[PDB]
Amino acid sequence: PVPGHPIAAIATPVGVGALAIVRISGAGVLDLADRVFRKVHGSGKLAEAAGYTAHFGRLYDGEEMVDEVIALVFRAPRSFTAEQMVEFTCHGGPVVVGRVLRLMLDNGCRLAEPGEFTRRAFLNGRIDLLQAEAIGEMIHARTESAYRTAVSQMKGDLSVRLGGLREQLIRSCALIELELDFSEEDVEFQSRDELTMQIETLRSEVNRLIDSYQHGRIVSEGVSTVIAGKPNAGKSTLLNTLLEECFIHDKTMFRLTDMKMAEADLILYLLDLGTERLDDELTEIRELKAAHPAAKFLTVANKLDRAANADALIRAIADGTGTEVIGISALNGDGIDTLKQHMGDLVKNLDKLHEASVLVTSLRHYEALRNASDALQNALELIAHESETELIAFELRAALDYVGQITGKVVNEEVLNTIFDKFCIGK
Template sequence: MTRSDAAPSEGEPIVAIATPVGVGALAVVRMSGSGVFDIADRVFSKAREPERPLAESPGYTAHFGRLYDGDSLVDEVIVLVFRAPNSFTMENMVEITCHGGPVVTKHVLKLLLDNGCRLAEPGEFTRRAFLNGRIDLLQAEAIGEMIHARSESAYRTAVNQMKGSLSGRLSELRDRLLQSRAMLELELDFSEEDVEFQSRDELSEQVDALQREVTELVDSYQHGRLLSEGVATAIIGRPNAGKSTLLNALLGEERAIVSHMPGTTRDYIEECFIYRNTMFRLTDTAGLREAVEEIEHEGIRRSYEKIAGADLILYMIDISEDDVDEEIPTISRISAEYPGTKLLVVANKIDRILEAPERMEAIRSACGCAVLGISALQEDGLAGLREEMNAMTRDLDKLHDASVLVTSMRHYEALRNAQDALQNARELIDAREETELVAFELRSALDYIGEITGRVVNEEVLNMIFDRFCIGK
């Protein structure tokens, strides 16, 4: 469906707790929709009387008073009034700041539900903001990404998107696509007269320019993904090489179970840590060996899945083992099979053997990859490891200074589809094919870009996006 650009309309009144559940000084309960002022007036008594009711109060005003359930006092609160269309949802809104705590907020929420509100669904406030034209779909997603940002760079990228940097770029692309398509549609209207309203050379140049811009956005996904999701880092190696110990040491907490028994890690464990503004998404995997049982075999299969999706592989070896050189073929094979992935051999337990430097050099020479010595248990060499991880992944950031980045797989796939449609259009133009075929490909590219901002969207996509939001957002 195509989103309507009609004037915003108010839906049924909804309510939700907008702050995290738990004990705190304050909490916020928000309402939006038709009749919210009347609902608030039924339960709220201002501290100073007589004053006009909330339904007659101007927008952006705060009112101190008490909430009552019949004759029973619920809480002393501050009520904020937002009048449509000058609110987040572009509907009439009321936000009630009460004392924090699960019992207090539960009573406030129940009071408003009993007086005519419906409990909001996940993301329903933001969904209404989108449907009423306050923000586009891309900006709505950016709000969710900002809330869930785990690093400063991810937060800054989300803020840029919420401000509309990517939306503006896509809007410009869409306008130019519309112009090119409009000329072709005009030709179709006059098809019997066999006229060209735009030369094919000029149209070809326009499509080339659009292709370059779409390709630039597609290419930015590599960096955008790293900012929003972190550098996918797989910790792999034989059982008992120290993978779980390293994960715990980098995180600074006992996240993974450490045991001397081989094969303890049956499934992967995933956690994040931040170093120099770069977020690393660490995955502790099952040890690589010939599995002795079905569960371990499945864990090893999942390990290889994580290796395939990694940006950085930390291959851990126990440098104190006499047969450590037998791991060289496996290291070389992984290096050859994943040439686009950074590989660092981490030689663990250097504190246990004097010959560690010589063994490390032999592996470095045989495999042609970086080798770094540490003692994960003693936390020796971890500072150097963090620096090396940061240095190795720095060049993944091809567009570090770019202000417009694609961070979502949904956006990336839509842009790839638009890229393909423009390529098809270019080939059709070169082959002097029918105008209708070229127009179809340009319409397809237009629709794919519209999917990102929500100009063209279906209910399933909306549900997928807003179900990820919390109830009060």
């Protein structure tokens, strides 16, 4: 259970508050703490204290009282990082808290890399990659549904389901992984008949998951929306009135941005109604819609506040493009309520299984679940007819390898880096 280098970090948000937490972790941490911590009543040393036990004392830079704090000892595996840690919670002043962090840093600790604490929690096996990512997802969450999704993932709901898939991928895999030497007349009395039934129910279980990512990505990172249109359309004017940037409506988040339009849930084409000289740029809107059939298209006719006649003009833009058109005054803010309601339509019209089925989020998992079900189909369709008995065991191990990668069974230490660099120093 090797401990890491002692590391320290401010664990609470930057700013002014009643209290802050400096948290240190790693090899010999509470011996280090003892050099600077001094118990106020009696001298019960921290290194002598039980886990989950709090101590009121003072921090010192040699006769220089840094602050009055409360030290929380954690021991053994029974901590967040699953190593030795103490957590000073001090007065929540920026100058004070910074002094505390420095004191730790001067007396043995190094500054924590971003997400290193959770990284250690995963590496020590207290928590898995899903759960690790879930911690991050919760802290950054800005929607209720995003928050609730991370709670589920932290609780491990997905991990349970994925563990229930590793089940057959241990069962049916090791069943053929023992063809190594004992292959003379190996059977289980019509055994391959049940193996196909194991895979068919196994692959369909993976498919139920790969499906939820459509809803999941929306809940996690919101409905990605592009605002298109030629210069002077009103793009800027709409953007800041609706609030790279995002806003919330009907418990759903919308990521507004410009430029990769491949992968974009909703396209809003802005064109200045009755103002456009060259109005056959509705040919342009016809070929945006055509180039992104997966997206939801929505034609936003701007500058409705002038020319009070444009009902026929709206219908002409509609008919000429086959898209849906909405009249908008981005300056005044007219019909915006109607535009917003049309935007909230995207989530409403999708699918969504019985709420028991947990939503998979994050591209990484999706792609792996795909890679798994492809290897599963390779065993199902490509191999299961007349093909060999050694190449089939390759595909099954490939699937178990893929399902396991999402939970961290196979550590990539670059998959980890992209995950934890996303975290902030302190977690």
